[PDB]
Amino acid sequence: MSNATKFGKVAVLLGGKSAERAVSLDSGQAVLDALLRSGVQAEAFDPQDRSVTELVNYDRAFIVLHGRGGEDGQIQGVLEWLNIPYTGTGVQGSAIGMDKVKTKQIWQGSDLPTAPYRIIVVMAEKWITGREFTISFLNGQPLPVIRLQYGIPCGLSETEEKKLQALCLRAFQAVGAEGWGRIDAMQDEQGNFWLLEVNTVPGMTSHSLVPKAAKAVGYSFDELCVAILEQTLE
Amino acid sequence: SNATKFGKVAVLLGGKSAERAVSLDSGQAVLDALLRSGVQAEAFDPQDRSVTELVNYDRAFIVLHGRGGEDGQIQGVLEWLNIPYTGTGVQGSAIGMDKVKTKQIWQGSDLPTAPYRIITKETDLDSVIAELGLPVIIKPVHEGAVVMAEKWITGREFTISFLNGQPLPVIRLQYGIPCGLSETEEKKLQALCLRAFQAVGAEGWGRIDAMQDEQGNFWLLEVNTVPGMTSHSLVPKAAKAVGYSFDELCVAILEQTLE
């Protein structure tokens, strides 16, 4: 049972219209090479150069557009209307995820910790000092946590780490994200966690954090790319 | 000036959802009203015409109800085709058509709404009847497979319709106006509902439904981001109460699609 047949003609959506275009071209190229190596019939699709109307020629879509259009529900919209299954988070989770105030609102509304904030678009947030982390997701489940300013190990105890993972899984589900993505979190001076933001189509460049964390659990980049694409089976 | 301004407008109607028939009715009404106002309107049924052809139009009047219309999908395609359109963008639409999400973001804005528990059909039922009390409303989440349980409150339902971002005269649900609220009590419900409208990031026009319990307290229920425009529909009724003819109301809504 081959990946040519099984996944059919897949479009790797890349580049796009946003300020993160260059990063997305990089993420796209990486993913495209990896899927081609895995024998999936992948092709590049840049919606800034090719009308989305031509998506109708493809059986599924690997979304690796960052920012406006990609991370915010728009392209997910068009794919729903063309009946083309696709990677990651649907319209709702995407549209929310790319709005901090809305992401915070729905987190507060789920009994989940996050800095207070006020109505100034950029907002005004309560300053907390501590160390930032990021919990990456694959198949709905969290992966090994990475410290931000190397990255792993993070500097949490094994139980302290699992606490941050379980908390972030709730914040991932709360906002209705699915498949894969990233949650950023804080740890204040007293050891308490605070949720910061969500990325519903993360970077897939060589320096990007999700492949790093997927590798920590034995996924090659090519394996990680197929795992993500498997979401598009029903 | 002289409805050269709006150009070739598409009235999106019918569609794929269970509310198709209602949408055909809302579409026809709106289409006739715009044509009477001298706007160059045409019908576009996305179930019969590929959305690809939307590129032939300068703007879109969305009057699709339910799945595809009320939930961010068609708003998506319009954003990607750079075609301005009526009502609420992708975010507000996608939220609005989800009750749990609408409630979450309302709780998160210090706004009143019935307690509820998302039924994973397996969470212990005893802890749920302990939180909410009996009787309890169970209802489907998006279309009012995933299901919820809400706390039953007794009282009288209302609906506050919106145009140009601002609320219109409130209507009692079972005629509808007068509602049976005092003039100050009515303004209280309007100001509350304006916050709940803004909170979810809806814009232009729409409807918020609200409760009043036996003690006089308000509770928010749900949001409709593309309301009915049929002859018996509630938004034209409330727009008429403030001196808008149906034709005038239809142009007012279309004006959202300008700078």
XYZ file of C-alpha atoms in Angstrom:
493
model
C 0.000 0.000 0.000
C 2.091 3.018 -1.293
C 2.104 6.690 -0.204
C 1.556 7.670 -3.819
C -1.816 5.918 -3.818
C -2.737 6.361 -0.160
C -2.409 10.182 0.096
C -2.891 11.003 -3.621
C -1.996 14.449 -5.012
C -1.054 16.583 -1.958
C -0.593 20.368 -2.122
C 2.010 21.904 0.215
C 0.594 25.369 0.810
C 3.535 27.748 1.289
C 4.696 31.367 1.037
C 1.455 33.276 0.911
C 0.659 36.914 1.572
C 1.863 37.668 5.113
C 5.001 39.235 6.574
C 6.179 35.700 7.461
C 6.283 34.761 3.716
C 10.048 34.103 3.578
C 9.906 31.839 6.658
C 6.931 29.997 5.063
C 8.810 29.414 1.807
C 11.557 27.868 3.932
C 9.070 25.734 5.911
C 7.349 24.725 2.694
C 10.504 23.670 0.850
C 11.608 21.573 3.810
C 8.249 19.801 4.059
C 7.953 19.335 0.318
C 11.385 17.664 0.107
C 10.533 15.415 3.065
C 7.204 14.266 1.650
C 8.749 13.670 -1.798
C 11.429 11.491 -0.125
C 8.641 9.559 1.565
C 7.095 8.867 -1.858
C 4.046 11.045 -1.414
C 2.994 12.858 -4.596
C 3.505 16.382 -3.187
C 3.534 19.696 -5.117
C 4.163 23.288 -4.037
C 1.260 25.697 -4.011
C 1.942 29.386 -3.305
C -1.434 31.134 -2.966
C 0.128 34.530 -3.684
C 1.229 33.205 -7.155
C -1.523 30.627 -7.888
C -5.235 31.304 -7.519
C -6.740 29.151 -4.739
C -9.299 28.033 -7.354
C -6.710 25.523 -8.657
C -6.666 23.752 -5.241
C -9.553 21.738 -6.638
C -6.935 19.677 -8.533
C -5.613 18.161 -5.212
C -6.818 15.430 -2.889
C -5.407 17.012 0.338
C -3.383 19.951 1.676
C -0.409 20.279 3.997
C -0.691 23.831 5.330
C 2.555 25.492 6.180
C 1.508 29.141 5.676
C 2.474 31.363 8.592
C 0.581 34.487 9.690
C -2.273 36.287 7.927
C -4.097 33.860 5.610
C -2.450 30.759 7.072
C -2.542 30.825 10.893
C -5.939 32.680 11.074
C -8.742 30.578 9.464
C -8.847 32.068 5.942
C -7.195 29.284 3.911
C -8.969 26.754 6.181
C -12.179 28.364 5.042
C -11.424 27.838 1.355
C -10.411 24.235 1.940
C -13.689 23.517 3.776
C -15.630 24.958 0.840
C -13.650 22.877 -1.676
C -14.054 19.660 0.433
C -10.289 19.117 0.623
C -9.034 17.659 3.946
C -6.072 19.447 5.484
C -3.508 19.509 8.278
C -3.813 21.030 11.697
C -6.430 23.266 13.144
C -9.809 24.111 11.601
C -11.332 27.561 11.085
C -12.395 28.250 14.644
C -9.145 27.307 16.447
C -7.056 29.104 13.855
C -9.048 32.334 13.965
C -8.926 32.416 17.770
C -5.303 31.233 18.081
C -3.958 34.155 16.100
C -5.673 36.628 18.446
C -4.097 36.963 21.899
C -7.022 38.759 23.585
C -9.380 36.080 22.230
C -6.990 33.276 23.200
C -6.806 34.742 26.704
C -10.557 35.261 26.960
C -11.222 31.608 26.138
C -8.488 30.474 28.530
C -9.852 32.606 31.458
C -13.236 31.115 30.485
C -11.807 27.558 30.940
C -10.307 28.168 34.412
C -6.738 28.400 32.959
C -3.904 30.676 34.102
C -2.802 33.677 32.067
C -1.578 37.196 32.744
C -4.192 39.866 33.376
C -4.508 42.398 30.564
C -6.448 45.509 29.552
C -8.153 46.998 26.577
C -5.570 49.146 24.747
C -3.861 45.708 17.466
C -1.571 45.424 20.512
C -2.953 45.362 24.130
C -1.512 46.065 27.682
C -0.429 42.977 29.736
C 0.672 42.474 33.380
C 4.446 42.007 33.620
C 5.515 38.620 35.100
C 9.199 37.713 35.335
C 10.325 34.120 34.810
C 11.555 31.597 32.238
C 9.671 30.949 28.941
C 9.023 27.440 27.553
C 7.282 25.861 24.569
C 5.303 22.652 24.399
C 4.958 21.322 20.883
C 2.088 19.066 19.834
C 1.776 16.104 17.500
C -1.287 13.844 17.094
C -3.044 16.015 19.665
C -0.550 15.039 22.402
C 2.297 17.191 23.820
C 5.957 16.504 23.055
C 9.098 17.144 25.210
C 9.250 20.765 26.451
C 11.918 23.189 25.254
C 13.293 26.197 27.176
C 13.501 29.502 25.243
C 15.866 32.510 25.691
C 20.389 25.129 23.658
C 16.730 23.959 24.493
C 16.456 20.443 25.997
C 16.609 19.439 28.750
C 14.455 22.398 29.861
C 15.467 22.600 33.531
C 12.208 21.303 35.028
C 11.886 18.215 37.193
C 10.319 15.221 35.444
C 7.074 15.733 37.409
C 7.198 19.571 37.003
C 7.556 18.947 33.261
C 4.516 16.583 33.105
C 2.508 19.227 35.005
C 3.280 21.816 32.313
C 2.430 19.273 29.570
C -0.975 18.360 31.061
C -1.826 22.041 31.596
C -0.831 22.893 28.013
C -2.873 19.971 26.634
C -5.940 21.540 28.277
C -5.106 24.986 26.819
C -4.604 23.345 23.392
C -7.977 21.567 23.589
C -9.703 24.606 25.137
C -8.978 26.763 22.127
C -9.966 23.831 19.834
C -6.646 23.319 18.138
C -5.970 19.911 16.691
C -3.243 17.765 15.165
C -0.127 19.749 15.823
C 1.013 23.137 17.009
C 2.815 24.960 19.811
C 1.814 26.451 23.180
C 4.176 28.969 24.828
C 4.159 29.156 28.651
C 5.886 31.118 31.485
C 7.166 29.995 34.883
C 7.203 32.812 37.510
C 9.591 33.093 40.498
C 7.218 31.015 42.710
C 6.998 28.003 40.304
C 3.491 28.849 38.914
C 2.703 28.477 35.199
C 1.135 31.131 32.955
C -0.063 30.639 29.391
C 1.101 33.118 26.772
C 0.157 32.210 23.202
C -0.615 29.510 20.627
C 0.832 28.787 17.133
C -1.454 26.607 14.998
C 0.936 26.266 12.022
C 4.488 26.208 13.482
C 7.797 26.625 11.658
C 9.322 23.673 9.831
C 12.678 25.361 9.015
C 15.971 23.729 10.112
C 16.189 26.002 13.177
C 12.488 25.431 14.145
C 11.348 24.110 17.520
C 8.755 21.421 16.596
C 11.147 19.159 14.680
C 13.600 19.563 17.580
C 11.006 18.328 20.077
C 9.727 15.562 17.695
C 13.313 14.349 17.300
C 13.590 14.078 21.106
C 11.006 11.263 20.840
C 12.569 9.567 17.822
C 10.877 11.260 14.845
C 13.026 12.082 11.851
C 11.868 15.167 10.015
C 10.486 12.962 7.225
C 8.609 10.865 9.750
C 7.266 13.968 11.457
C 6.067 15.314 8.098
C 4.166 12.106 7.298
C 2.691 11.951 10.841
C 1.293 15.466 10.351
C -0.077 14.547 6.899
C -1.838 11.457 8.374
C -4.287 13.867 10.158
C -5.893 14.309 6.711
C -7.163 10.686 6.774
C -10.774 11.362 7.912
C -23.082 58.500 -6.033
C -25.988 57.055 -8.091
C -25.435 53.226 -7.291
C -22.499 53.073 -9.616
C -20.696 52.917 -6.210
C -21.497 49.381 -5.183
C -20.652 47.841 -8.576
C -21.483 44.188 -9.324
C -22.722 42.812 -6.018
C -23.252 39.021 -5.371
C -26.084 38.040 -3.022
C -24.806 34.757 -1.553
C -27.831 32.542 -0.884
C -29.027 28.966 -0.477
C -25.832 27.051 0.098
C -25.139 23.660 1.576
C -26.668 23.682 5.080
C -29.920 22.422 6.535
C -31.116 26.069 6.560
C -30.897 26.184 2.709
C -34.606 26.806 2.085
C -34.702 29.656 4.633
C -31.578 31.123 2.970
C -33.166 31.030 -0.502
C -36.050 32.996 1.001
C -33.691 35.519 2.709
C -31.661 35.789 -0.493
C -34.613 36.429 -2.782
C -35.942 39.119 -0.474
C -32.596 40.897 -0.276
C -31.942 40.546 -3.988
C -35.350 42.144 -4.849
C -34.742 44.963 -2.378
C -31.278 45.784 -3.703
C -32.515 45.615 -7.334
C -35.279 48.128 -6.375
C -32.602 50.380 -4.887
C -30.739 50.325 -8.207
C -27.764 48.284 -7.069
C -26.465 45.831 -9.680
C -27.177 42.697 -7.621
C -27.116 39.052 -8.768
C -27.877 35.770 -7.049
C -25.026 33.422 -6.247
C -25.845 29.977 -4.851
C -22.563 28.309 -3.831
C -24.156 24.852 -4.014
C -24.924 25.439 -7.763
C -22.025 27.778 -8.718
C -18.373 27.170 -7.841
C -17.076 29.871 -5.458
C -14.251 30.401 -8.003
C -16.643 32.581 -10.043
C -16.970 35.038 -7.096
C -13.937 36.723 -8.609
C -16.356 38.328 -11.154
C -17.940 40.518 -8.384
C -16.894 43.676 -6.572
C -18.623 42.823 -3.241
C -20.803 40.249 -1.509
C -23.984 40.418 0.527
C -23.889 37.240 2.644
C -27.235 35.804 3.490
C -26.204 32.115 3.881
C -27.471 30.562 7.108
C -25.749 27.769 9.031
C -22.805 25.642 7.946
C -20.727 27.499 5.351
C -22.440 30.842 5.987
C -22.679 31.609 9.715
C -19.355 29.854 10.629
C -16.365 31.536 8.885
C -15.963 29.311 5.768
C -17.386 31.594 3.038
C -15.783 34.557 4.883
C -12.519 32.745 4.416
C -12.916 32.461 0.622
C -13.904 36.082 0.326
C -10.799 37.193 2.273
C -8.616 35.192 -0.077
C -10.323 36.682 -3.161
C -10.003 40.227 -1.771
C -13.808 40.814 -2.071
C -15.362 42.961 0.714
C -18.467 41.528 2.351
C -21.266 42.054 4.851
C -21.314 41.343 8.530
C -18.865 39.486 10.657
C -15.393 38.315 9.662
C -13.875 34.825 10.021
C -13.183 34.938 13.742
C -16.553 36.243 15.003
C -18.432 33.932 12.664
C -16.509 30.798 13.668
C -16.980 31.553 17.359
C -20.602 32.744 17.076
C -21.792 29.435 15.635
C -20.299 27.564 18.613
C -22.220 27.941 21.863
C -19.500 26.607 24.189
C -17.003 28.973 22.549
C -19.455 31.868 22.646
C -20.007 31.176 26.338
C -16.302 30.774 27.088
C -15.495 34.163 25.595
C -18.455 35.731 27.396
C -17.425 34.277 30.833
C -13.938 35.563 29.924
C -15.356 39.114 29.485
C -17.285 39.132 32.839
C -20.600 38.689 31.106
C -23.582 36.684 32.424
C -24.532 33.330 30.933
C -25.938 30.022 32.143
C -23.476 27.519 33.571
C -22.873 24.494 31.356
C -20.782 21.264 31.011
C -19.422 19.914 27.759
C -20.641 16.302 27.647
C -17.866 14.007 26.807
C -20.503 11.227 26.754
C -18.680 9.463 29.640
C -17.892 12.244 32.252
C -19.547 11.232 35.493
C -23.183 12.436 35.313
C -23.444 12.861 39.117
C -20.848 15.702 39.225
C -22.762 17.381 36.361
C -26.218 17.221 38.083
C -24.401 18.462 41.228
C -22.953 21.546 39.423
C -26.015 22.589 37.434
C -29.077 21.256 39.292
C -32.157 19.716 37.673
C -33.879 20.199 35.342
C -31.079 20.486 32.749
C -31.122 21.423 29.021
C -28.989 19.181 26.830
C -28.569 20.558 23.257
C -26.334 20.101 20.171
C -23.413 22.608 20.172
C -22.971 24.169 16.712
C -26.457 23.811 15.052
C -29.041 25.597 17.281
C -22.310 14.715 17.185
C -20.779 17.109 19.752
C -23.280 17.816 22.600
C -23.544 20.039 25.722
C -25.575 20.307 29.023
C -26.849 23.775 30.146
C -28.413 24.935 33.414
C -32.213 25.455 33.015
C -33.357 29.013 33.850
C -37.059 29.985 33.753
C -37.957 33.358 32.304
C -38.816 35.363 29.212
C -36.582 35.316 26.087
C -35.709 38.481 24.108
C -33.653 39.391 21.042
C -31.587 42.478 20.382
C -30.871 43.024 16.706
C -27.879 45.010 15.509
C -27.273 47.386 12.626
C -24.160 49.509 12.014
C -22.697 47.945 15.157
C -25.404 49.473 17.380
C -28.417 47.696 18.941
C -31.975 48.196 17.701
C -35.299 48.042 19.651
C -35.657 44.770 21.603
C -38.277 42.180 20.694
C -39.883 39.642 23.048
C -39.976 36.022 21.810
C -42.945 33.672 22.420
C -46.465 40.393 17.985
C -43.097 41.276 19.671
C -42.816 45.022 20.443
C -43.379 46.452 22.957
C -41.233 43.880 24.770
C -42.593 44.465 28.282
C -39.431 46.030 29.746
C -39.282 49.493 31.205
C -37.434 52.037 29.041
C -34.413 51.987 31.414
C -34.557 48.197 31.806
C -34.565 47.976 27.997
C -31.491 50.255 27.637
C -29.742 48.050 30.237
C -30.321 44.965 28.103
C -29.153 46.873 24.974
C -25.897 48.077 26.558
C -25.203 44.580 27.952
C -25.854 42.993 24.547
C -23.638 45.559 22.785
C -20.764 44.370 25.013
C -21.523 40.709 24.236
C -21.654 41.583 20.505
C -18.292 43.372 20.649
C -16.794 40.727 22.971
C -17.198 37.986 20.316
C -15.964 40.421 17.634
C -19.139 40.474 15.555
C -19.579 43.519 13.350
C -22.113 45.262 11.175
C -25.321 43.471 11.925
C -26.640 40.424 13.713
C -28.729 39.244 16.655
C -28.114 38.493 20.339
C -30.672 36.392 22.232
C -31.038 37.014 26.005
C -33.076 35.675 28.963
C -34.666 37.451 31.895
C -35.084 35.148 34.946
C -37.887 35.417 37.560
C -35.705 37.859 39.656
C -35.090 40.405 36.815
C -31.485 39.310 36.010
C -30.234 39.006 32.384
C -28.487 35.999 30.885
C -26.930 35.744 27.420
C -27.873 32.751 25.281
C -26.584 32.883 21.701
C -25.481 34.961 18.732
C -26.579 34.931 15.038
C -24.059 36.620 12.727
C -26.192 36.292 9.529
C -29.832 36.647 10.590
C -32.966 35.846 8.598
C -34.259 38.357 6.058
C -37.552 36.529 5.294
C -40.878 38.406 5.692
C -41.434 36.991 9.184
C -37.849 37.567 10.339
C -36.983 39.594 13.440
C -34.274 41.979 12.213
C -36.437 43.811 9.650
C -39.138 44.063 12.324
C -36.757 45.801 14.728
C -35.208 47.967 11.966
C -38.739 49.086 10.982
C -39.386 50.146 14.622
C -36.668 52.787 14.082
C -37.897 53.868 10.585
C -35.997 51.555 8.177
C -37.901 50.071 5.258
C -36.662 46.672 4.211
C -35.015 48.228 1.167
C -33.315 50.831 3.334
C -32.169 48.174 5.784
C -30.713 46.126 2.893
C -28.698 49.087 1.612
C -27.539 49.979 5.174
C -26.160 46.461 5.568
C -24.475 46.610 2.147
C -22.808 49.952 3.105
C -20.571 48.022 5.548
C -18.662 46.859 2.433
C -17.344 50.456 1.840
C -14.377 52.382 3.346
